[PDB]
């Protein structure tokens, strides 16, 4: 049925959202470094997080003890327009966060299917559970590269591998994605949304726990891992 338990934080402006979200993430990463010696952060791509990344890059925490990776990646060169790694390197891995330990998902294999196993092994060393995961949501209800238009959705939702390939039919590029099992083996998830359309889609997502229609529900419907939704018009 519908999803009834939520934690929802709204803000005047995207800048107010970012300022707060950057502070919460930085605090949680530093508390993880304090507790365990190394922390792990998963971030998502797109235009939504770019200012957040800029703000995070200036936070004075032990960045060199933070391991960072991507929720998903387009199977394109890491300097291409469509690369999430390119956006992360330009905007996050700057300033104080220059010092962090980033690993992307793209590798030399010609397809995500062929590269997935190498990608999964390259992360086997990240601190898990992940300390902080930052997600987005598409207007179709997708998150990561868990797309309702892809044949590989059930695999993404049920595999124990850390990452798998997916091939959306309603969005461009072969994809690699972290799996549900990987994303939910985390301490804190943030869902970062902007604008009235995304708010409408989020409300639609709460109408049910049918993950195959809107895969963001796999994150919203569960009760073990805290999820805080940050939104501004």
DSSP symbols for 31-85: HHHHHHS-EEEEE--SSTTHHHHHHHHH--S-GGGEEEEESEEESS-TTSTT-HH
User: What are the CB-based long-range contacts (under 8 Å, 24+) for 206-210?
Assistant: 206/2, 206/3, 206/4, 206/6, 207/2, 207/3, 208/1, 208/2, 208/3, 209/1, 209/2, 209/3
Give me the DSSP letters along 97-142. Answer: GGGSEE--S--SSSSHHHHHHHHHHHTTTS-SSBSEEEE---TTS-
Determine phi and psi for 46, rounding to 5 degrees: 90, 180
Q: How far apart are the first and last CA of the chain?
A: 28
DSSP state for residue 146 in the 8-state scheme = B
232 touches 17 (CB < 8 A)? yes
Tell me the C-alpha distance between 35 and 150, whole Å. Answer: 39
CA dist., res. 168 & res. 21, Å (int): 30
Which technique was used to obtain these atomic coordinates?
Answer: X-ray
Helix axes 84-91, 50-58, angle to 10 degrees: 40
Question: Could you give the C-alpha distances from 27 to 4, 32, 51, 65, 131, in angstroms and in order?
Answer: 28, 9, 18, 14, 11
From 189, 187, 175, 183, select the one nearest 85 (Cα to Cα): 175
In this structure, the number of other CB atoms found within 10 A of the CB of residue 37 comes to 10
Output Rg (C-alpha) for the chain, integer angstroms: 16
Task: Let me know: does 39 contact 129? Beta carbons within 8 Å.
Answer: no
Asked if residues 169 and 149 have their Cβ atoms less than 8 Å apart, the reply is yes
Q: Whose CA is closest to 116, among 67, 172, 182, 68?
A: 182
Query: How far is 214 from 205, CA to CA, in rounded Å?
Result: 6
Q: Are 99 and 64 in contact (CB under 8 A)?
A: yes
Cα–Cα–Cα angle for 116, 64, 182, nearest 5°?
30
Q: For the domain 1-233, what is the CATH code?
A: 3.40.50.1360
CA atoms within 13 A on the CB side of 224: 7
Ranges of each domain in the chain: 1-233
Q: Which long-range contacts (CB under 8 A, 24 or more apart) does 87-93 make?
A: 87/45, 87/46, 87/50, 87/53, 88/43, 88/45, 88/53, 91/50, 91/53, 91/54, 91/57, 92/43, 92/53, 92/54, 92/56, 92/57, 92/68, 93/57, 93/68
The residue written with tokens 């939704």 in the block is 229
4/23 Cα distance (integer angstroms): 27
């Amino acid at each position: 049925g519908m999803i009834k338990e939520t934690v929802f934080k709204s803000f005047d402006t995207p800048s107010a959202l970012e300022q707060q979200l950057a502070s919460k993430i930085a605090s949680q990463l530093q508390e993880a470094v304090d507790a365990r010696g190394k922390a792990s952060l998963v971030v998502s791509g797109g235009s939504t997080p770019l200012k957040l990344f800029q703000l995070l890059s200036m936070k004075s925490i032990d960045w060199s003890d933070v391991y960072i990776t991507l929720a998903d990646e387009r199977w394109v060169e890491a300097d291409a327009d469509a690369s999430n790694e390119r956006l992360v390197r330009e905007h996050l891995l700057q300033n104080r966060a220059s010092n962090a330990k980033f690993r992307g998902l793209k590798n030399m294999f010609s397809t995500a299917e062929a590269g997935a196993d190498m990608a999964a092994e390259s992360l086997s060393n990240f601190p898990r559970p992940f300390d902080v995961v930052v997600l987005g949501m598409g207007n179709d209800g997708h998150t990561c590269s868990w797309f309702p238009c892809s044949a590989e959705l059930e695999n993404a939702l049920t595999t124990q591998a850390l990452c798998v390939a997916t091939n959306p039919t309603t969005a461009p590029h072969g994809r690699i994605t972290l799996s549900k099992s990987a994303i939910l083996n985390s301490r804190q998830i943030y869902l970062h949304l902007v604008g009235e359309q995304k708010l409408s889609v989020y409300r639609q997502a709460l109408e049910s726990d049918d993950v195959h229609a809107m895969p963001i529900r796999a994150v919203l419907a569960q009760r073990k891992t805290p999820v805080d939704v940050f939104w501004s018009a």
